[PDB]
Amino acid sequence: DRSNFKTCDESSFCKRQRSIRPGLSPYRALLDTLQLGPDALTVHLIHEVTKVLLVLELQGLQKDMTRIRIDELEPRRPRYRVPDVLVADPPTARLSVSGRDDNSVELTVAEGPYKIILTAQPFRLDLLEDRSLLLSVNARGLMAFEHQRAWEETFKTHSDSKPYGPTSVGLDFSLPGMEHVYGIPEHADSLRLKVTEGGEPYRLYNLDVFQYELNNPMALYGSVPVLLAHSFHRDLGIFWLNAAETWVDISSNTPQTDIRWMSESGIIDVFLMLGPSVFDVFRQYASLTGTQALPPLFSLGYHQSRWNYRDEADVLEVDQGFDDHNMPCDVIWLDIEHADGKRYFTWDPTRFPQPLNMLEHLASKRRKLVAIVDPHIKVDSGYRVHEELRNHGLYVKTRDGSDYEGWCWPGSASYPDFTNPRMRAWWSNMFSFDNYEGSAPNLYVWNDMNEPSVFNGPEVTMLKDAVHYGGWEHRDIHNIYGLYVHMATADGLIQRSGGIERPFVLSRAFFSGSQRFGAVWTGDNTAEWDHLKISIPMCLSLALVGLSFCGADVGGFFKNPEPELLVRWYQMGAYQPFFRAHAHLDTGRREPWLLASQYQDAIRDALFQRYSLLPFWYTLFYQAHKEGFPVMRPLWVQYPEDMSTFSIEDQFMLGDALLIHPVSDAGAHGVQVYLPGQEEVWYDIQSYQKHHGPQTLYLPVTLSSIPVFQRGGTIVPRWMRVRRSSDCMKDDPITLFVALSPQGTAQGELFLDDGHTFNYQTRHEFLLRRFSFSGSTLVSSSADPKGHLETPIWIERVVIMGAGKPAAVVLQTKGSPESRLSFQHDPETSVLILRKPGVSVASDWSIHLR
Amino acid sequence: KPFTCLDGTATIPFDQVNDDYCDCKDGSDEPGTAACPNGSFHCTNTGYKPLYILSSRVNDGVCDCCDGTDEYNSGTVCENTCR
Ligand SMILES: O=[N+]([O-])c1cc(-n2nccn2)ccc1NCCCCCCN[C@H]1C[C@](O)(CO)[C@@H](O)[C@H](O)[C@H]1O
Numbered sequence: 037d038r039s040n041f042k043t044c045d046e047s048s049f050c051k052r053q054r055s056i057r058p059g060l061s062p063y064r065a066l067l068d069t070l071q072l073g074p075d076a077l078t079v080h081l082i083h084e085v086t087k088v089l090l091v092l093e094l095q096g097l098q099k100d101m102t103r104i105r106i107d108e109l110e111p112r113r114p115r116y117r118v119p120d121v122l123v124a125d126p127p128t129a130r131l132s133v134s135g136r137d138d139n140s141v142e143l144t145v146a147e148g149p150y151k152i153i154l155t156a157q158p159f160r161l162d163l164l165e166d167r168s169l170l171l172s173v174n175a176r177g178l179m180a181f182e183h184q185r186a187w188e189e190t191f192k193t194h195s196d197s198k199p200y201g202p203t204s205v206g207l208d209f210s211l212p213g214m215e216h217v218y219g220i221p222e223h224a225d226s227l228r229l230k231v232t233e234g235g236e237p238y239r240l241y242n243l244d245v246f247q248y249e250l251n252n253p254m255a256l257y258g259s260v261p262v263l264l265a266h267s268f269h270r271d272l273g274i275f276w277l278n279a280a281e282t283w284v285d286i287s288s289n290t291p292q293t294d295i296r297w298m299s300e301s302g303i304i305d306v307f308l309m310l311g312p313s314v315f316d317v318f319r320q321y322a323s324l325t326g327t328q329a330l331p332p333l334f335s336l337g338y339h340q341s342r343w344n345y346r347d348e349a350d351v352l353e354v355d356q357g358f359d360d361h362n363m364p365c366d367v368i369w370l371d372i373e374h375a376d377g378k379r380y381f382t383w384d385p386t387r388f389p390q391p392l393n394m395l396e397h398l399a400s401k402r403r404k405l406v407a408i409v410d411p412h413i414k415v416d417s418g419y420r421v422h423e424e425l426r427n428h429g430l431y432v433k434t435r436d437g438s439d440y441e442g443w444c445w446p447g448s449a450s451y452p453d454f455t456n457p458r459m460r461a462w463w464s465n466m467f468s469f470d471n472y473e474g475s476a477p478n479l480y481v482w483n484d485m486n487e488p489s490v491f492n493g494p495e496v497t498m499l500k501d502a503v504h505y506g507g508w509e510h511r512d513i514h515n516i517y518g519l520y521v522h523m524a525t526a527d528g529l530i531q532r533s534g535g536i537e538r539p540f541v542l543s544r545a546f547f548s549g550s551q552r553f554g555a556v557w558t559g560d561n562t563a564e565w566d567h568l569k570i571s572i573p574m575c576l577s578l579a580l581v582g583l584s585f586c587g588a589d590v591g592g593f594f595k596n597p598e599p600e601l602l603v604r605w606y607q608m609g610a611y612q613p614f615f616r617a618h619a620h621l622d623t624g625r626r627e628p629w630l631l632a633s634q635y636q637d638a639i640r641d642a643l644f645q646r647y648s649l650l651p652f653w654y655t656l657f658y659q660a661h662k663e664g665f666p667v668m669r670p671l672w673v674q675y676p677e678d679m680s681t682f683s684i685e686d687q688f689m690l691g692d693a694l695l696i697h698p699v700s701d702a703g704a705h706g707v708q709v710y711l712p713g714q715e716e717v718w719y720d721i722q723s724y725q726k727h728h729g730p731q732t733l734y735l736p737v738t739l740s741s742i743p744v745f746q747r748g749g750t751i752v753p754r755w756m757r758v759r760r761s762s763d764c765m766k767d768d769p770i771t772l773f774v775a776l777s778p779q780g781t782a783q784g785e786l787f788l789d790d791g792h793t794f795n796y797q798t799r800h801e802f803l804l805r806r807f808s809f810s811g812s813t814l815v816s817s818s819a820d821p822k823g824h825l826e827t828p829i830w831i832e833r834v835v836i837m838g839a840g841k842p843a844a845v846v847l848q849t850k851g852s853p854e855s856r857l858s859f860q861h862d863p864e865t866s867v868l869i870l871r872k873p874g875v876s877v878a879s880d881w882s883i884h885l886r
Numbered sequence: 887k888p889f890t891c892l893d894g895t896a897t898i899p900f901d902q903v904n905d906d907y908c909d910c911k912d913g914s915d916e917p918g919t920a921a922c923p924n925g926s927f928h929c930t931n932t933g934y935k936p937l938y939i940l941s942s943r944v945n946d947g948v949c950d951c952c953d954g955t956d957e958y959n960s961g962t963v964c965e966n967t968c969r
């Protein structure tokens with residue numbers, strides 16, 4: 037089982053690094069070599085025993101960040117520096133020497149308040165805001181930098197020639213006052229990260245783990261080397277920009293958390309993101325690696341998938357099944373059995389002979405299709421893709437110069453070198469409608485197995501000593517191989533349209549920056565209740581590090597879920613960003629209408645709730661795209677001073693407005709919902725019952741229950757006319773749900789555009805509306821005047837929670853006479869429904885309750 | 887004269903029949919629009935069998951009636967296929 041994968045003791049560089057224990061560091065800074073440059077401070081470091089000379093490059097950056105880079109002064113060969121992950125060269129701030137002694141130099145970033153104290157012996161860095169110590173570097177003396185010398189290592193039957201010998205780097209960080217750290221996905225583990233003292237470090241190495249288990253630090257399919265630290269008082273982030281195999285130790289100790297990163301090769305390159313709030317950290321990290329790509333609206337709908345739908349007739353029966361059972365669905369997925377023997381970009385000539393016709397039928401239902409395209413290419417001289425890549429030398433190579441060959445789904449297969457920009461350009465051009473024969477504008481793509489998975493490779497992946505573009509070793513680039521696949525596919529979908537259509541690409545492997553290219557999911561989970569539960573902490577850990585478009589297979593990939601579990605997973609999935617049902621080849625069919633009526637009805641209700649909330653989902657993703665704020669959020673992000681939220685992972689927020697506690701236990705009769713916030717009220721969106729915070733509420737549940745609460749002070753837009761797909765709905769009127777604060781106020785936003793193009797950016801064709809309630813007046817105004825949109829969308833209804841009965845309701849909009857609205861009021865629930873305002877969503881207007 | 891919902895839940899002026907807002911709990915005030923969640927739209931289908939469709943499929947861009955009358959203001963032009 038797990039003997040297939042290295043523990044830290046079996047990873048020779050991790051064993052060496054981790055044997056260095058906290059103590060007096062042998063490194064010291066040579067203050068005579070210190071130079072203050074235009075962008076950076078450089079100073080030489082030296083190992084006291086080996087006399088090896090390193091160069092520290094220290095930079096203050098705009099937006100309250102610090103960058104630390106350490107490399108060899110005179111290396112025999114260049115070390116790897118991670119490309120294509122940073123979206124720009126980060127703007128710097130000026131450093132000044134503002135203090136110095138014989139063993140210390142104090143530096144000021146710009147004109148304050150941030151300062152960096154460089155200690156010479158032993159080498160050390162302290163980061164301060166005024167006189168408050170924020171963070172220390174190498175305080176435990178764990179810095180380790182194996183220089184390149186003038187080795188051979190075997191695991192199971194695979195031998196790493198390791199021609200450059202030991203080159204691993206490592207460094208420790210101390211976080212005074214921090215007891216809670218988060219991030220570094222992907223692990224099937226709790227949201228709040230555990231100390232690693234008595235066990236394994238957390239491992240970051242994109243790996244394909246068959247039937248992975250829960251509550252363990254084994255590396256899974258993706259790696260985002262970003263750690264967030266939260267306390268009552270401050271938020272910090274650490275971004276370790278290294279693409280090699282990386283291990284992370286976490287230890288606690290007046291409260292303080294120490295973090296240690298250990299990577300196989302490359303330079304030391306770390307960003308310190310100083311907050312002070314968690315939203316400052318979100319902004320800081322987004323300025324470095326970018327923001328969530330704005331998904332086309334259809335991709336926020338429901339996806340129906342399995343391994344595998346049999347043929348074109350099966351796909352069309354599934355499509356018709358949704359309409360015959362009145363369930364919405366936007367996309368049906370085609371797994372690997374749709375191709376000719378797992379030759380990607382092809383179609384099985386018997387079961388998919390007319391793909392354009394199938395796609396046309398789906399388009400007539402205003403639905404899409406997703407086809408899988410993996411990055412392993414069958415070694416087959418009749419396969420044009422293989423022949424082109426072979427002839428143009430675009431494959432990953434071995435040390436003897438031959439193309440690397442491993443084993444995957446089509447048998448023997450080679451692996452394109454996606455680190456090569458010429459290879460990525462070839463890949464993108466292959467998605468043209470002339471090259472990818474049988475594709476059409478409503479066909480989108482799923483990249484799987486892009487760790488890369490190699491069935492006969494060490495740890496089921498590529499050999500460390502395979503050779504990539506520019507002579508870099510596979511051990512140097514491993515964790516960005518999948519990102520490059522994701523990136524090139526997404527660019528292919530953009531290019532095939534002439535640069536107009538937004539892409540949709542789901543990817544299994546990922547790295548920092550993958551949020552720019554589409555969605556991810558947590559791989560091959562299992563149809564069990566604890567796998568349902570763990571989807572929240574896994575997608576929350578991804579949300580915190582910028583990957584907002586996350587989900588888990590609804591129903592579980594492996595095994596057959598009992599119907600009650602499948603209902604609960606639909607309810608859970610309906611309130612998570614990427615919403616796809618998927619299943620293993622040997623499972624029973626579980627399209628949602630194959631269940632008994634009581635289970636069908638609960639699932640249909642969950643699908644209707646999701647489709648009604650699409651305007652809300654779309655606006656949260658627009659805010660993620662513009663600001664870098666996560667869509668799905670831990671409670672502690674919204675309540676940073678409520679220490680009882682710091683570990684919660686059976687509950688989450690969507691934006692700031694909705695709190696979700698899905699039922700995740702068989703036979704449950706109720707749930708305990710923690711409603712946070714001093715002076716805060718929460719509305720049960722099914723009963724409209726208002727609840728004051730903070731409290732733990734016992735809420736009885738039935739099979740149809742999805743515990744959802746809207747926060748007082750928020751306005752949530754909904755499409756109350758659920759149709760068969762999102763395309764059918766995107767011209768429909770909006771219903772506004774206004775949840776009044778105790779002060780009688782509320783606010784919200786709404787983003788609208790054509791739903792699938794870049795016209796919002798290239799032509800400013802979009803709407804961003806601000807809705808605000810205060811006193812007794814609801815006002816719609818523009819939150820961005822640059823955006824204009826031709827749209828028939830109008831406001832058909834306003835639902836106000838927590839309001840008394842007015843005497844009259846008066847609407848004013850520019851260009852129209854003052855109008856009277858009829859209304860309905862429930863004295864028991866204090867719910868006020870305003871009938872048919874009838875005003876365009878593009879117009880300024882106000883409604884007054886008299 | 888006013889219109890009365892077939893379930894007696896309300897009585898509204900006939901200017902609220904097919905006014906693209908749902909006023910009757912049974913959906914009976916909007917037989918020709920997509921406004922009510924429980925409504926139905928009648929395909930006359932001269933030349934085939936008459937059909938009832940969900941109100942949510944009125945002007946959804948998809949051709950549901952063979953005579954094409956469910957799509958009258960959606961940008962989709964449906965051809966007659968009752969043959
Ligand atoms: O130990 N091995 O790795 C191994 C080794 C050999 N082998 N040994 C010597 C020679 N060959 C053969 C098989 C295996 N693994 C077997 C079965 C894993 C099934 C899981 C796949 N899940 C993804 C694929 C996709 O299933 C379908 O595209 C999706 O549906 C999912 O969504 C994806 O996540």
Ligand SMILES: [Ca+2]
Nearest residue numbers: 902907909915
């Ligand atoms: Ca009406």
Ligand SMILES: [Ca+2]
Nearest residue numbers: 943948950956
């Ligand atoms: Ca229709």
